[PDB]
Amino acid sequence: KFPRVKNWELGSITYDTLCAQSQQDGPCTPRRCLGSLVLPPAEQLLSQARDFINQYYSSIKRSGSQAHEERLQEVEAEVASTGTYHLRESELVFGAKQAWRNAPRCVGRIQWGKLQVFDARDCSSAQEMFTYICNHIKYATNRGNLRSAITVFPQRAPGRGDFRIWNSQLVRYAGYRQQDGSVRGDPANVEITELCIQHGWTPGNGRFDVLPLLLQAPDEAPELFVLPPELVLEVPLEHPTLEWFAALGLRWYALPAVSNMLLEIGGLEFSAAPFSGWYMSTEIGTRNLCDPHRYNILEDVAVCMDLDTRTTSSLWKDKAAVEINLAVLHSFQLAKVTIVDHHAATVSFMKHLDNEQKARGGCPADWAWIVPPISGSLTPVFHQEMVNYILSPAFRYQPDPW
């Protein structure tokens, strides 16, 4: 019995047979569904490694050659003697792309084949991590013509502490907790802001202060590195027809570079492996600026637009959000920085699902994350049933290192 998956807008049906290859577990059982939840030996490492080596040789269509068997022997010999093994650059490149491809929450996977992979496994200090991170940013930003990248730092080792980037993204704005309860800047970054200050960073007092990085080499206290302002491209927000909107002094950074997830390839774990593509506009316009526990600017905007704030039924919240998202798109386009709107992103994801159906017999997708945060049923993904499951290589959550 395999999942029948229906698109309700077109009446079409597919069957997901790729989920059979799931060896990892989602949070659900048959007695209760936990899907909307945001967070969750050597022959076993070996069996994940053989499997991953199998994927890789199949990918280059050498699925049986001398090379294939000799490579499995290498991996077997290395695990038998040392309890672990190492990946070849080109396996690593293939694993990273496959991790992205398999990421159920990513709407931008049409892009999965085009990922610049920086091998930083020859990295031995916080200082080197920083240099690599700077290269990553410079490459990925590309004066606003954004390019997808990942930089992979040295894998976890049974002996020692992990390499980690303590920040959750490479670029984030500071959130300064007030004694009077409230937050100046981004409330989601209060804890990382506090951490930075105590490892000796001099704070600013703005709404949009770019945080320094805390980089940790194994079993060493993390170190502080301030990003060179010229590396951090930012887009001031204005609105195409509302002149007052610019007066709000809103801005956002160009580069979304997630730096806290663990990358897992054939049983090996890469605890520092920051990755970036480009923003979908609703991430900034709806979530970051309008979430009540984020910058929460909807009321400010509604009042400027002169809307009736006293009642939910004037749909003031909805009207303001739409203008905010429009401002984000307009500003990014004016500054010539890559962005995709939620309509174009979901249309391309549909094409991706279809590609994936033909190529693998299904696609892991997390509906609550693929459907955008405004205008859901106005996008084709709303009407598309979706099956969520964990394939490996995978990006996974890991504990905060402090």
Ligand X SMILES: NC(=[NH2+])NCCC[C@H](N)C(=O)O
Length of the chain: 402
Catalytic residue among 71, 101, 109, 164: 109
Long-range contacts of 116-119 (CB under 8 A, 24+ apart): 116/140, 116/147, 116/148, 116/149, 116/150, 117/92, 117/93, 117/149, 117/150, 117/152, 118/149, 118/150, 118/151, 118/152, 119/89, 119/92, 119/152
- Using CB under 8 A as the binding rule, the residues of this chain from 362 to 401 that contact a second copy are 366-368, 371-378, 380, 382-383, 385-389
Catalytic residue among 100, 112, 252, 278: 278
Task: Tell me if residue 283 is catalytic.
Answer: yes
CA-to-CA distance for 105 and 107, rounded, in angstroms? 7
| Nearest alpha-carbon partner for 5 in 384, 391, 389 | 384
Pairing of strands 268-270, 262-265: antiparallel
Q: Is residue 104 a contact residue for ligand X (CB under 6 A)?
A: no
Binding mask 270-289 for ligand X (x = CB under 6 A): ------xx-x---xx--xx-
Helices 42-59 and 66-82, axial angle in degrees (round to 10): 160
Residue 252 known to bind ligand: no
In sequence order, what are the residues at sequence separation of 6 or more whose Cβ sits closer than 8 angstroms to the Cβ of residue 37? 27
User: Between 304 and 374, whose beta carbon lies closer to a second copy?
Assistant: 374
Residue type, 19: C
User: Between 5 and 345, whose beta carbon lies closer to ligand X?
Assistant: 345
- What would you measure as the largest C-alpha separation in the chain, in angstroms? 73
- Using CB under 8 A as the binding rule, the residues of this chain from 31 to 50 that contact a second copy are 31-39
- Using CB under 5 A as the binding rule, the residues of this chain from 28 to 47 that contact Zn ion are 28, 33, 35
- Using CB under 8 A as the binding rule, the residues of this chain from 235 to 274 that contact a second copy are none
Q: Under a CB-based contact definition with an 8 Å cutoff, are residues 346 and 379 in contact? A: yes
CA-to-CA distance for 370 and 188, rounded, in angstroms? 22
Q: Is residue 60 a contact residue for a second copy (CB under 8 A)?
A: no
Q: Is residue 105 a contact residue for ligand HEM (CB under 6 A)?
A: yes
User: Between 75 and 364, whose beta carbon lies closer to ligand HEM?
Assistant: 364
Residue 48 known to bind ligand: no
Which residues belong to the active site?
106, 109, 278, 283
**Residue ranges for the binding site?**
28, 33, 36, 106, 169, 278-279, 283, 288, 368-369, 382, 397
**Residue ranges for the binding site for heme b?**
106, 397
- Give the binding site for ligand HEM (CB under 6 A): 100, 103, 105-108, 111, 115, 148, 150, 258, 261, 275, 277-278, 280, 283, 340, 345, 369, 395
